[PDB]
Amino acid sequence: MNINDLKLTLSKAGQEHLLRFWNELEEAQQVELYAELQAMNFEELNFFFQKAIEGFRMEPVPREVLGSATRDQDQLQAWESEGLFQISQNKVAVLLLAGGQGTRLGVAYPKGMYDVGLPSRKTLFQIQAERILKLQQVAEKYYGNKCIIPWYIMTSGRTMESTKEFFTKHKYFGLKKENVIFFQQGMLPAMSFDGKIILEEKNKVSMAPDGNGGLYRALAAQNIVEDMEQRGIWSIHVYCVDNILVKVADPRFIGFCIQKGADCGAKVVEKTNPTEPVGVVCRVDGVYQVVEYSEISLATAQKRSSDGRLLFNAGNIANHFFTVPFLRDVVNVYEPQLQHHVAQKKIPYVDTQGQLIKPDKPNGIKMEKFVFDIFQFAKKFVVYEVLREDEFSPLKNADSQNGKDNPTTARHALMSLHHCWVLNAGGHFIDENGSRLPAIPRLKDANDVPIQCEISPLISYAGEGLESYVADKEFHAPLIIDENGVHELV
Amino acid sequence: INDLKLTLSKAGQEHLLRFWNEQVELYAELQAMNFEELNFFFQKAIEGFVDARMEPVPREVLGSATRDQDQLQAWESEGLFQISQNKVAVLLLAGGQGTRLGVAYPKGMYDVGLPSRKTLFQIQAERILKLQQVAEKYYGNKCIIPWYIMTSGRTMESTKEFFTKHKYFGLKKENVIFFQQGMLPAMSFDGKIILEEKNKVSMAPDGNGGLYRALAAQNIVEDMEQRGIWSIHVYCVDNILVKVADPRFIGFCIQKGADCGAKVVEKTNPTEPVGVVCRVDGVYQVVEYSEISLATAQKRSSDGRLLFNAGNIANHFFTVPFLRDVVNVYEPQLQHHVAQKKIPYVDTQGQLIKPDKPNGIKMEKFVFDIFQFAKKFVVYEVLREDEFSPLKNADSQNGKDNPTTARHALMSLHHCWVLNAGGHFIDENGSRLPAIPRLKDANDVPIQCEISPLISYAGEGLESYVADKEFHAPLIIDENGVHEL
Ligand SMILES: CC(=O)N[C@H]1[C@@H](OP(=O)(O)OP(=O)(O)OC[C@H]2O[C@@H](n3ccc(=O)[nH]c3=O)[C@H](O)[C@@H]2O)O[C@H](CO)[C@@H](O)[C@@H]1O
Numbered sequence: 018m019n020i021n022d023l024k025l026t027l028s029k030a031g032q033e034h035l036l037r038f039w040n041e042l043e044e045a046q047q048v049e050l051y052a053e054l055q056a057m058n059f060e061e062l063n064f065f066f067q068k069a070i071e072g073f074r075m076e077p078v079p080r081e082v083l084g085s086a087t088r089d090q091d092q093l094q095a096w097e098s099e100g101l102f103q104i105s106q107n108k109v110a111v112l113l114l115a116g117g118q119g120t121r122l123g124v125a126y127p128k129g130m131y132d133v134g135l136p137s138r139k140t141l142f143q144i145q146a147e148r149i150l151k152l153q154q155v156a157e158k159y160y161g162n163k164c165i166i167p168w169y170i171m172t173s174g175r176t177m178e179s180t181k182e183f184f185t186k187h188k189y190f191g192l193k194k195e196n197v198i199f200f201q202q203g204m205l206p207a208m209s210f211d212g213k214i215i216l217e218e219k220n221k222v223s224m225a226p227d228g229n230g231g232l233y234r235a236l237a238a239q240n241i242v243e244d245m246e247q248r249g250i251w252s253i254h255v256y257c258v259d260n261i262l263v264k265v266a267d268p269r270f271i272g273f274c275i276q277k278g279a280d281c282g283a284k285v286v287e288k289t290n291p292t293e294p295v296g297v298v299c300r301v302d303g304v305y306q307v308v309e310y311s312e313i314s315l316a317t318a319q320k321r322s323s324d325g326r327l328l329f330n331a332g333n334i335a336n337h338f339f340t341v342p343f344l345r346d347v348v349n350v351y352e353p354q355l356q357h358h359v360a361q362k363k364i365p366y367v368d369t370q371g372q373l374i375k376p377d378k379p380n381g382i383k384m385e386k387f388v389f390d391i392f393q394f395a396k397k398f399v400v401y402e403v404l405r406e407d408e409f410s411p412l413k414n415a416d417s418q419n420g421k422d423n424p425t426t427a428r429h430a431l432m433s434l435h436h437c438w439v440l441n442a443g444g445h446f447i448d449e450n451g452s453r454l455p456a457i458p459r460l461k462d463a464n465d466v467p468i469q470c471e472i473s474p475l476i477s478y479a480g481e482g483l484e485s486y487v488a489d490k491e492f493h494a495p496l497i498i499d500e501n502g503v504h505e506l507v
Numbered sequence: 508i509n510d511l512k513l514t515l516s517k518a519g520q521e522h523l524l525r526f527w528n529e530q531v532e533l534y535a536e537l538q539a540m541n542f543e544e545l546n547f548f549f550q551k552a553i554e555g556f557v558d559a560r561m562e563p564v565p566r567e568v569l570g571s572a573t574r575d576q577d578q579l580q581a582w583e584s585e586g587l588f589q590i591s592q593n594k595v596a597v598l599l600l601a602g603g604q605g606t607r608l609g610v611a612y613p614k615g616m617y618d619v620g621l622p623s624r625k626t627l628f629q630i631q632a633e634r635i636l637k638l639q640q641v642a643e644k645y646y647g648n649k650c651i652i653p654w655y656i657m658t659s660g661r662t663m664e665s666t667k668e669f670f671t672k673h674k675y676f677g678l679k680k681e682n683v684i685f686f687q688q689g690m691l692p693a694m695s696f697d698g699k700i701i702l703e704e705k706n707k708v709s710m711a712p713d714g715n716g717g718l719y720r721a722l723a724a725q726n727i728v729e730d731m732e733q734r735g736i737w738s739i740h741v742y743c744v745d746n747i748l749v750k751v752a753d754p755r756f757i758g759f760c761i762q763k764g765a766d767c768g769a770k771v772v773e774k775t776n777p778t779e780p781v782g783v784v785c786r787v788d789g790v791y792q793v794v795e796y797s798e799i800s801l802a803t804a805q806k807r808s809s810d811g812r813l814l815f816n817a818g819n820i821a822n823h824f825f826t827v828p829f830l831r832d833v834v835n836v837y838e839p840q841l842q843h844h845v846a847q848k849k850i851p852y853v854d855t856q857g858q859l860i861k862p863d864k865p866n867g868i869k870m871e872k873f874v875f876d877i878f879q880f881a882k883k884f885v886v887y888e889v890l891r892e893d894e895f896s897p898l899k900n901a902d903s904q905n906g907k908d909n910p911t912t913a914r915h916a917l918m919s920l921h922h923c924w925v926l927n928a929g930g931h932f933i934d935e936n937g938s939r940l941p942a943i944p945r946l947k948d949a950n951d952v953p954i955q956c957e958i959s960p961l962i963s964y965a966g967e968g969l970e971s972y973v974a975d976k977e978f979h980a981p982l983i984i985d986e987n988g989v990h991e992l
């Protein structure tokens with residue numbers, strides 16, 4: 018096997034242009050490109066592209082399959098108890114989707130390492146770790162035994178190394194290294210409209226992660242489902258890394274799904290603005306699915322039911338519940354049926370002249386599978402609705418962009434929530450003279466700021482357990498309550 | 508000589524002349540303050556330093572643009588007819604002034620960064636011009652919607668200058684009426700008027716409820732009657748989406764026989780800073796966002812919505828006879844709302860300081876505190892994406908209601924109007940773009956679109972401009988036609 022054999026393989030697949038700069042490359046760059054091309058399956062790539070080019074009504078879910086933290090408040094205690102019981106029996110794991118890479122936030126590292134500016138400065142990864150540690154601790158107190166919630170973390174080619182080092186450096190935030198399982202998802206090449214793979218540099222193919230639905234081939238590639246079975250796990254909480262409010266391994270959502278006998282569940286918040294970028298959960302021809310926000314028509318998005326609400330209001334917050342036997346079937350049977358969603362994009366490339374170009378017009382497509390496309394195969398699907406102020410504030414954009422879902426909105430949503438937890442547990446906030454501040458601040462002058470408050474997950478998972486700390490007392494913000502006590506910063 | 512000196516003495520405000528022997532303007536201002544009244548206001552306001560009695564808005568007084576869509580045409584027709592008969596005026600509350608946005612001019616002059624660069628004042632003026640034009644086409648006669656603008660001592664001059672410079676944006680000078688609202692001094696917790704400068708008293712506008720005394724001082728109500736106006740649409744200057752003189756809301760109040768109406772949007776987040784309309788002891792009130800308890804704000808009804816979900820967007824309907832009664836009879840009943848403040852001051856020893864802790868309070872009357880006197884009050888609910896995106900904070904602050912959110916809310920709305928009228932947006936290759944874009948890369952931006960009010964007031968009248976056509980954003984549609992930037 019040499020360059021001659023590779024040239025023939027590429028030419029038979031219509032990709033010989035991938036070696037066009039070979040004679041101009043430094044020897045080290047030829048070694049690199051040769052290795053990369055050798056690891057690609059050009060036949061499969063050609064097939065994916067063909068389907069993508071070829072592949073180039075909705076009804077709300079029935080009320081019988083939808084549960085609501087707000088309208089079904091009378092059942093929360095029973096669901097929470099069932100969820101904590103499962104966690105205590107070591108039957109629950111969580112799986113974090115952290116393979117996304119893109120630079121829209123303007124930084125080079127993965128989003129889980131981002132510091133949105135909380136008083137504690139904790140990154141998303143650390144806040145998530147502390148919620149998992151908190152539940153292991155709470156379950157042990159209500160049942161007596163120690164328990165474990167394994168943390169599977171999916172990374173991509175451009176995040177595996179950095180994510181691993183970050184964790185190593187932080188001593189896995191207090192969890193045991195043997196209970197954090199990193200695995201990488203696959204990558205796919207950008208392709209021009211004509212079917213040719215795009216070179217980003219003279220010696221580098223333009224590659225990107227294969228979508229969060231690439232989760233299923235990644236699980237098969239690293240025998241993850243076998244690992245789950247061997248650990249004796251029944252339930253998997255799959256979730257998105259970018260939401261500072263995510264209730265990792267939420268016992269209420271998990272208990273609800275277990276009690277309903279579901280093999281698949283989706284957590285949602287009410288969509289109220291027609292153009293909000295969230296996919297909507299629904300069914301077509303009796304089969305459940307999510308219609309992504311970029312695939313819905315304005316007429317559909319704006320449609321209203323008789324009560325005044327949007328007809329399609331179950332907004333996907335990328336928090337799902339899957340049982341292990343369902344994932345096993347997905348991985349060994351259904352995966353090939355998941356289709357690639359295609360996006361036209363401006364892909365930086367090197368031109369036939371050897372210069373690096375930033376296209377003024379889309380020059381190719383990106384193919385990706387979506388994690389929620391397996392809902393259609395579930396034997397029993399349920400939906401669980403929660404309030405967005407308690408559970409959903411995503412980090413998608415930089416502050417300098419469109420004005421929403423950015424670090425500023427994220428830190429303020431967490432601080433407003435924790436400020437409410439204190440008020441609800443009987444505490445109050447005061448100004449410098451000790452006069453009581455209102456629940457909603459008058460922000461009238463340039464120096465006025467909202468109340469800054471942050472409670473560590475170790476202290477409170479969702480608002481419980483604060484009365485002994487704050488009932489009948491008043492605090493000067495910024496207020497932090499953590500394992501080292503109560504702290505008023507200056 | 509010691510005439511004012513004795514005046515201050517009886518009021519216990521003699522300290523205001525502590526830097527006198529160290530003198531003209533400090534006299535002109537000092538002699539325009541009713542010290543007797545100010546002590547009375549302070550005592551009552553500070554006195555003793557409602558939630559349990561709050562009841563939700565009943566369905567009988569609430570109309571909805573969404574739920575009552577079948578009646579919109581009739582309401583819209585009634586409002587346009589009124590406008591055509593010269594029976595409608597608007598009143599802008601533009602006396603507010605603060606350092607929050609970090610600029611030295613009034614909010615009406617703010618340019619939030621739209622493709623046209625228009626200021627809030629200009630957009631509002633064009634919506635007025637637009638309804639005069641539409642009413643003339645439908646009924647045949649030229650008509651007038653007078654524009655009363657309330658300013659404060661810190662906005663009056665700048666405002667007039669700006670309008671003069673812009674030739675009143677196309678409206679006639681005689682139909683734009685400026686008037687100033689009164690002012691109030693900051694006071695220490697012990698009731699002592701605070702001096703900002705050894706020669707200047709710390710002063711601020713007396714709240715938007717200061718509107719009623721302002722109307723009396725300048726005989727504004729008489730002007731309205733002289734013009735034959737029946738309906739007045741009162742509105743806040745900071746909302747880029749405000750439907751000035753909205754025929755639907757005006758038509759709804761007229762048809763319901765109301766003398767007072769409040770437009771609202773559904774409040775869905777318990778801590779959103781909007782006052783909530785409610786009923787207390789049989790009469791309507793707005794409980795301001797800074798006066799509600801968290802328990803009440805968070806309460807939910809059986810259908811899952813907030814129990815107090817009628818969010819005030821500071822857009823009110825008042826009949827002229829009601830305002831007359833308020834100005835001449837009820838006004839004295841309005842109470843002052845208090846807020847502690849860090850007031851920059853010049854204490855003894857001519858020392859100028861910036862308080863590290865609040866050092867006094869400011870008093871304000873609120874415009875909606877007259878709802879309780881209405882003979883027939885109504886509430887009209889609209890969608891926030893069509894009607895409410897306020898400018899309250901600078902971009903560098905808390906992350907909401909800033910120039911960025913305001914410009915994006917107007918452009919998203921106009922982008923929707925184009926789609927709903929049959930137009931399409933395309934990328935550089937001519938492929939059609941989705942209604943909701945995937946924003947994944949550093950350079951991805953939502954569709955920029957801006958339609959001048961002179962072309963479309965609320966999404967109508969666009970068929971001949973965009974139906975079955977494709978456009979490359981930024982797209983601007985104005986009196987000069989369609990422009991692709
Ligand atoms: C496809 C999908 O899930 N869409 C949901 C996602 O949209 P959104 O537009 O965020 O979709 P993305 O696929 O980019 O990202 C979602 C998550 O998937 C991860 N990721 C993405 C690509 C990849 O190859 N590998 C990978 O692991 C990201 O790290 C993130 O954790 O969140 C929204 C809520 O905020 C939901 O309303 C959308 O329905």
Ligand SMILES: CC(=O)N[C@H]1[C@@H](OP(=O)(O)OP(=O)(O)OC[C@H]2O[C@@H](n3ccc(=O)[nH]c3=O)[C@H](O)[C@@H]2O)O[C@H](CO)[C@@H](O)[C@@H]1O
Pocket residue numbers: 600601602603604657659688712713714715717742743744745780781782783793795796818819820821873874875897899
């Ligand atoms: C008292 C009042 O109206 N509160 C409403 C105002 O609150 P908010 O606190 O946001 O607003 P402000 O009272 O400061 O200002 C409202 C309007 O009144 C004007 N103004 C203010 C003070 C003054 O002395 N003179 C004056 O003319 C401002 O120029 C602005 O046009 O808008 C919100 C919607 O965004 C509503 O939910 C609040 O219930």
